[PDB]
């Protein structure tokens with residue numbers, strides 16, 4: 028049972044929950060790989076038994092009446108057909124648990140308040156699109172954002188797979204150039220290639236909302252233009268730096284992740300887009316400033332008249348703070364839910380305390396919980412964390428092509 | 429077989445083949461990563477020594493030669509006769525450099541080959557120990573033009589207690605527990621402060637009182653030694669454009685000299701081997717001055733800057749901290765005292781990483797320690813995956829002598 032210390036306060040806890048870890052991670056006694064982004068059939072019954080036992084424990088109803096019964100149906104469902112269907116409530120409780128189990132999510136204090144849309148009866152790219160569009164419009168909610176996940180049909184053998192070919196529902200275009208460099212978002216350069224490939228007309232913009240590429244089983248993808256009124260965007264302005272607006276920067280309101288495999292009770296949902304709301308540093312620091320993303324940092328420094336000639340002026344840090352100020356100021360003026368890294372990390376500590384008494388600990392990935400600016404000014408920095416894999420879970424999956 | 433490591437900034441990919449020769453085991457398992465935790469007989473002595481001698485003879489391009497085999501047998505014979513062996517001087521210099529080179533939490537290792545090794549293995553008493561330390565401080569400080577130095581005191585050996593420096597660093601500020609539970613000075617140094625007083629140090633009552641040294645010779649109690657004032661180069665903190673900042677009375681010292689770690693070379697253990705380099709500005713400005721459990725000056729600075737400290741979304745904390753780091757860099761450069769900012773340091777560590785991949789097929793690095801505590805993703809190390817493992821020779825933590 029790992030001893031885990033908070034260095035700001037001196038407190039000690041033990042992660043007893045870690046002993047239940049499922050799909051082992053990438054680290055061995057001889058070398059730690061925690062910093063790596065992507066870690067280097069009849070036993071479906073084991074993962075179904077486990078999840079069902081989880082479900083009935085969470086309603087103070089283990090070993091009573093319906094618990095026994097539900098074990099036999101999945102036994103019979105898999106005995107007969109090889110796979111099984113989740114009761115609607117189980118799908119809800121498992122979608123919530125997988126968010127609860129996400130070691131890299133700093134937003135998990137909200138895990139109990141998640142809206143699960145059941146799309147298990149979906150059948151093709153036009154049906155998906157309307158599900159995706161209901162999610163987007165529900166989640167966006169005129170800027171009063173609400174956590175949502177739409178669960179598309181589970182995978183079963185011998186037939187294809189529902190997939191969203193975009194990493195998120197809202198992505199900006201990346202346009203390669205006559206000289207390799209990129210106008211727009213370089214993280215998306217490739218899905219821009221596929222959208223252009225399958226018929227989309229490339230704009231000329233740094234911020235062109237990409238179309239969607241939705242794929243029904245066995246059929247090739249099909250482009251879907253997103254309703255421009257459904258794609259809520261925030262222009263970025265700064266409260267005191269009047270020229271910031273003139274940089275023509277924008278970001279979207281809705282972080283909706285559409286490429287992760289949701290895995291509940293041994294079942295695989297390669298299409299289950301989830302969404303919450305942004306922490307400002309995701310936008311201001313990673314998306315706008317990462318050297319391989321919009322990479323705007325030096326442009327804002329010039330505008331601030333900072334000495335970019337020596338790094339000891341800390342011009343990078345100064346411009347990065349003002350970018351984050353602009354992001355928070357703009358989303359607030361636009362009345363769009365956003366949370367700064369201090370409020371977010373403080374609520375994560377509160378979540379750690381809740382999880383400690385509730386489940387005996389909490390899988391947390393220190394490198395992803397600690398914000399990408401001002402790390403040690405937030406409490407999570409001083410909190411030792413234990414990383415491990417519990418089920419239900421969100422897992423990465425290979426790109427469909 | 430070998431970990432594939434990606435740099436996300438450039439897209440680059442390497443394989444850390446060096447990780448496969450990891451001489452000891454870390455705290456992680458396939459169940460669970462513990463990489464964020466701060467504190468994770470003749471046969472094995474023989475095989476560690478044999479491995480180190482092989483390393484040493486590789487570096488001087490004498491692998492498998494006559495000199496090499498003679499030294500193995502010499503060591504095996506001395507381990508059989510005495511239960512221990514003695515390093516030649518050149519092996520010691522190589523072993524201290526390697527230990528620095530192998531330290532995964534150290535972002536300053538581009539410099540590892542330029543290390544000044546003082547051989548104090550003939551030290552006899554605490555008084556001689558103090559003189560060796562004063563000359564280390566004098567040489568490393570070098571009037572503000574800092575040089576990397578390690579002074580190696582006699583190895584652990586059977587029959588004798590250890591040389592130990594009780595202080596975690598050669599220069600530390602006292603932490604005076606006051607009666608509220610509040611601390612005047614550095615709260616990290618409350619324990620060593622009480623020990624110094626208990627050993628007869630007359631306390632001051634400032635916030636930057638330099639602590640005396642508690643020096644332990646084999647099988648003796650610790651002995652108190654006052655550092656001569658003109659040997660502890662200090663830097664008053666001022667800000668280039670916030671002039672009220674100098675009225676905070678803040679200071680820090682020039683020399684970061686870690687004195688409580690164990691240097692291990694070929695199975696031999698040196699519990700006393702203080703090493704020193706020069707500061708990276710975020711250690712002082714962010715960690716030592718802004719940590720809530722250290723000097724915790726963040727709020728007072730933000731208030732003086734007239735930031736709105738009632739809401740977090742004004743980012744007053746980030747704004748105050750940036751300016752504290754500016755003050756640190758300005759103050760040291762004004763005082764002509766070596767200092768590196770987290771941008772210059774992380775960039776040189778990237779060059780270290782590339783040098784080490786070519787030299788050894790990888791480099792042990794502890795990402796959470798290499799990434800600076802502010803502005804993390806603005807530095808290049810953030811976007812570099814890293815492999816953490818224990819190579820030997822090594823610096824290791826050890827329990828406090830008390």
Ligand code: HEM
Pocket residue numbers: 122126129131132133134135137141174175176287301302303304305306309366371395421
């Ligand atoms: C509601 C407020 C939320 C906040 C503030 C938030 C914030 C974050 C942040 C900053 C990360 C770091 C990962 C990255 O940026 O690459 C993350 C990871 C993650 N979050 Fe959340 N999130 C929220 C909601 C949700 C919801 C509703 C779900 C799913 C139901 C979710 C699932 C995940 C997963 C699976 C990851 C890890 C994926 C990865 O590392 O790429 N989050 N979250």
Ligand code: HEM
Pocket residue numbers: 524527528531533534535536537539543576577578703704705706707708711715768773797823
């Ligand atoms: C000369 C410039 C140097 C710089 C800029 C530098 C920088 C750093 C920094 C920022 C850390 C993390 C400190 C912390 O917050 O815990 C560190 C750790 C460390 N350094 Fe270096 N260092 C330098 C020289 C040296 C030398 C000369 C040695 C030994 C010969 C050394 C050995 C270590 C070790 C063993 C650690 C790990 C201890 C720990 O992480 O608690 N460093 N270094």
Ligand SMILES: CN(C)CCc1cc(F)c(F)c(CCc2cccc(N)n2)c1
Pocket residue numbers: 134282283284301302303304305306309313314
């Ligand atoms: C470098 N970084 C920009 C990578 C972007 C990225 C890639 C992923 F796969 C991923 F799951 C997330 C999660 C972001 C997220 C999800 C839900 C709410 C929220 N507020 N945020 C973010």
Ligand SMILES: CN(C)CCc1cc(F)c(F)c(CCc2cccc(N)n2)c1
Pocket residue numbers: 536684685686703704705706707708711715716
């Ligand atoms: C409080 N927290 C910052 C940790 C303090 C701490 C504890 C250690 F054991 C340790 F080796 C170092 C390294 C500090 C250092 C050494 C050499 C040069 C440099 N520039 N810095 C720092």
Ligand SMILES: C[C@H](O)[C@H](O)[C@H]1CNc2nc(N)[nH]c(=O)c2N1
Pocket residue numbers: 034393408409410411412464465466796797798
């Ligand atoms: C608990 C957490 O891992 C701990 O505070 C670590 C994080 N990274 C660090 N990095 C450095 N350079 N120094 C530190 O003391 C720490 N502390």
Ligand SMILES: C[C@H](O)[C@H](O)[C@H]1CNc2nc(N)[nH]c(=O)c2N1
Pocket residue numbers: 061062063064313394395436810811812813814
């Ligand atoms: C190498 C390092 O692990 C990698 O850059 C990680 C660190 N933390 C991150 N944190 C977030 N939110 N997103 C990322 O892409 C990363 N990348």
Ligand SMILES: [Cl-]
Pocket residue numbers: 282309314
């Ligand atoms: Cl994002």
Ligand SMILES: [Cl-]
Pocket residue numbers: 684711716
């Ligand atoms: Cl320090």
Ligand SMILES: [Gd]
Pocket residue numbers: none
């Ligand atoms: Gd101007």
Ligand SMILES: [Gd]
Pocket residue numbers: 669670671
């Ligand atoms: Gd001024």
Ligand SMILES: [Zn+2]
Pocket residue numbers: 054058059060061456460461462463
């Ligand atoms: Zn690990």
